[PDB]
Design a protein around this ligand. Structure first.
Ligand SMILES: [Cl-]
Ligand SMILES: [Cl-]
Ligand SMILES: [K+]
Ligand SMILES: [Mg+2]
Ligand SMILES: [Mg+2]
Ligand SMILES: [Mg+2]
Ligand SMILES: [Mg+2]
Ligand SMILES: [Mg+2]
Ligand SMILES: [Mg+2]
Ligand SMILES: [Mg+2]
Ligand SMILES: [Mg+2]
Ligand SMILES: [Mg+2]
Ligand SMILES: [Mg+2]
Ligand code: NA
Ligand code: NA
Ligand code: NA
Ligand code: NA
Ligand code: NA
Ligand code: NA
Ligand code: NA
Ligand code: NA
Ligand code: NA
Ligand code: NA
Ligand code: NA
Ligand code: NA
Lengths: 119, 65, 81, 194, 46, 56
RNA sequence: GCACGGAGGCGAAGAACCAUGGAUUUCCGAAUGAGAAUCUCUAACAAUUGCUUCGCGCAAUGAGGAACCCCGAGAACUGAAACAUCUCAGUAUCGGGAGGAACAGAAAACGCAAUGUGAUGUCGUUAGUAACCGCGAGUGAACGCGAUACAGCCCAAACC
RNA sequence: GCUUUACUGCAGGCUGUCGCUGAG
């Protein structure tokens, strides 16, 4: 909410999660806000996901601006448990980072484009 | 006295209960005789009746009835 | 566990009740109700209890005046004890 | 590289600027409508909590407590008093608000013990602190080598005896040298002079 | 006044404590009830 | 009316009674509070340091 | 049993008596199903909590104790030959709470300034010294030293 | 104990200021 500056259409979010699932199986993904933050800082992140139902918001507040000054693209997901399940967890996840997609580098790259356009 | 611990343990759970209700009755009748100022007493027994009853209840507990 | 009946209450007045009204008098546990007294009494003396009256006495015990049916004779029930 | 936690910490260095400032302005509205002690599922300042002992584990509890700001709520003397002892307005309690907060929380959870606590801001008339409490009877804690110490009998009611971090600092036990002549080993054994 | 069952029990006990040391106890001890209480001269509790 | 003997006649009111918790005739039946042990007021037992000399 | 009476009884089937362990252990009482001056009324962890199979299922708290101990609240008589700061005194007393002992404790120390000491209590001393104070009356340490006993470690984070 | 334009203070009321506290 305070860290969310644009709304992601339901359909876009689905494509994103889908891509994430094929990423854990075909490529590599980082689950958890601490491991995600480090991707963005180490530059190994290609697409980072951030939940919108995070409380406290402090846990994710930094993702946006951090991602911006690092070129890394990011997309918002409404449900915290959907991102976690998509990432392959039995629990939820406040943030995730597709560290080098897999058999999705295409859809992924396009999702990044759709969002950049979503302003 | 007249009723020892061995003899209580050599009784079946049902014999202790039958023996128990028997002692209670002797007791109750001793108290009645007493309540009537009856002198045919023998103090040593009305006291033994209480202890005998305690022994039986103690054993019923130890044995599991 | 406490017993209902404690002992027969035998006094001049209890005799008159026994001889003239077919009633028996007992000292019972003060936690006992008329019903419990009626039952306990029947099971102990094999008689039919018609009515029970109670009183918490200035001795700290409860007194029950138990009347037996015309079928039973108080005088006799009391003589065997 | 910087931990994600370092960002929560850094934001709280200045609770009146940036995004945090706006969160607070929003949050306090709901807080002011909550009770004295509110159990919360997650710590508002995760970094601070973990730093003080918090663990996402069974038997670890967190609660936000609100306490009024200011000096002692004191009644004026009703009998003879020399001028020096006639004050009311400027008298302040010797126990800090954070400590009052820790006690109110512990009383709310009679079976739990206070591990530590930290500030989460204030408005014009009250302050909020989040207290971390621990269930000394839960096996998930009795088997934790980092927290099991809090299960010993001598740790019962630790908060009420000043054994808390805030308790020890407020007791003047911070310094090991000059200045702690009347505080260590205890205020009472030193005659109550610090 | 209206006494309750418990009060009645206590009064009963006080009346009982108001008896004398039995004669045989004198002989058995080779030789007084300091708890003697008259209803008029003394006052009970409650 | 004299505050002494003549005013002693109206005293037939029962207040302090035998207490269920401590046994003392201090249970004030009007207040339902024992002035001796604190029953009715405190779960903890009534007790004060001034009930004995300061150094004892 | 104290308790030496009367009567009667128990004990060689080893009683009495002592030690340890076990059984029984009414009602009120923190008192907890609800109410009540120790009783009563129609199944009960009342209340607050943790876990949770989200069901009181598994658990915790409550109250006591000779003083000691820790954390809060905190006088006045008195002394100053009056009295206000000061003093009595952080005493009396009050609120909360632990244990068999508490508390303290492995340096953002000390500062005989050093090429030195090396967690913490406590005892002796340092010393009525330094310091405070209508600079009045009064108040009053510490470092060090000699002893006692000695013990040193775990997280948060980085990287996983 | 009481009084007051006795001494010294303490509640309380009034008033400025800071925090809560923000936009043009
Ligand atoms: Cl605590
Ligand atoms: Cl040195
Ligand atoms: K004074
Ligand atoms: Mg009647
Ligand atoms: Mg000490
Ligand atoms: Mg009489
Ligand atoms: Mg008068
Ligand atoms: Mg009850
Ligand atoms: Mg003077
Ligand atoms: Mg002078
Ligand atoms: Mg002083
Ligand atoms: Mg020094
Ligand atoms: Mg470790
Ligand atoms: Na009787
Ligand atoms: Na507690
Ligand atoms: Na001080
Ligand atoms: Na009288
Ligand atoms: Na016992
Ligand atoms: Na319980
Ligand atoms: Na339950
Ligand atoms: Na003087
Ligand atoms: Na004077
Ligand atoms: Na002075
Ligand atoms: Na030296
Ligand atoms: Na006067």
């Amino acid at each position: 909410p305070v860290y969310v500056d644009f709304d992601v259409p339901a359909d876009l979010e689905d494509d994103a999660l889908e891509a994430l699932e094929v990423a854990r199986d075909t490529g590599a993904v980082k689950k958890g806000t601490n491991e995600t933050t480090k991707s963005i800082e180490r530059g190994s992140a290609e697409l980072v996901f951030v939940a919108e139902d995070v409380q406290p918001e402090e846990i994710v507040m930094h993702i946006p601006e951090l991602a911006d000054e690092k070129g890394v693209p990011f997309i918002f997901v409404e449900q915290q448990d959907d991102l976690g399940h998509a990432a392959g967890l039995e629990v939820g996840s406040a943030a995730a980072a597709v560290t080098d997609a897999g058999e999705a580098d295409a859809d992924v790259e396009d999702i990044a484009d759709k969002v950049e356009e979503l302003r | 006295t007249v009723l020892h611990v061995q003899e209580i343990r050599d009784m079946t759970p049902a014999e202790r209960e039958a023996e128990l209700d028997d002692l209670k009755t002797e007791l109750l009748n001793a108290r009645a005789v007493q309540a009537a100022g009856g002198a045919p007493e023998n103090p040593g027994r009305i006291k033994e009746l209480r202890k005998a009853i305690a022994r039986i209840k103690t054993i019923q507990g130890e044995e599991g009835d | 566990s406490w017993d209902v009946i404690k002992h027969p209450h035998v006094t001049e007045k209890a005799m008159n009740d026994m001889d003239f009204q077919n009633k028996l008098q007992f000292a019972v546990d003060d936690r006992a109700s008329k019903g419990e007294v009626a039952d306990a009494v029947e099971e102990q003396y094999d008689v039919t209890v018609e009515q029970v009256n109670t009183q918490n006495t200035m001795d700290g015990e409860k007194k029950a005046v138990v009347r037996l049916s015309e079928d039973d004779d108080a005088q006799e029930v009391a003589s065997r004890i | 590289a910087r931990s994600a936690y370092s960002y929560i910490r850094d934001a709280w260095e200045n609770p009146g600027d940036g995004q945090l400032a706006e969160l607070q302005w929003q949050r306090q509205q709901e807080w002011r409508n909550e009770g004295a002690v509110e159990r919360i599922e997650r710590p508002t300042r995760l970094d601070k909590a973990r730093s003080q002992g918090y663990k996402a584990k069974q038997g670890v509890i967190v609660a936000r407590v609100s306490v009024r700001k200011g000096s002692a709520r004191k009644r004026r003397h009703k009998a003879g008093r020399r001028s020096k002892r006639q004050g009311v307005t400027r008298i302040t309690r010797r126990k800090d608000i954070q400590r009052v907060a820790e006690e109110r929380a512990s009383r709310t959870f009679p079976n739990l013990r206070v591990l530590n606590s930290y500030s989460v801001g204030q408005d014009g008339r009250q302050k909020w602190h989040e207290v971390i409490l621990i269930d000394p009877n839960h096996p998930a804690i009795q088997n934790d080598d980092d927290l099991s110490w809090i299960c010993a009998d001598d740790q019962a009611d630790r908060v009420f005896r000043g054994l808390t971090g805030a308790g020890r600092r407020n007791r003047g036990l911070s310094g090991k040298g000059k200045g702690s002549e009347k505080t260590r080993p205890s205020l009472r054994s030193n005659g109550g002079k610090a | 006044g209206k006494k309750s069952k418990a009060t009645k029990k206590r009064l009963a006990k006080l009346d009982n404590q108001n008896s004398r040391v039995p004669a045989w106890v004198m002989l058995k001890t080779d030789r007084r009830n300091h708890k003697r209480r008259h209803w008029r001269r003394n006052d009970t509790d409650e | 009316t004299g505050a002494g003997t003549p005013s002693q006649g109206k005293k037939n009111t029962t207040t302090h009674t035998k207490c269920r918790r401590c046994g003392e005739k201090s249970y004030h039946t009007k207040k339902k509070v024992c002035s001796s042990c604190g029953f009715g007021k405190s779960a903890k037992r009534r007790d004060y340091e001034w009930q004995s000399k300061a150094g004892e």
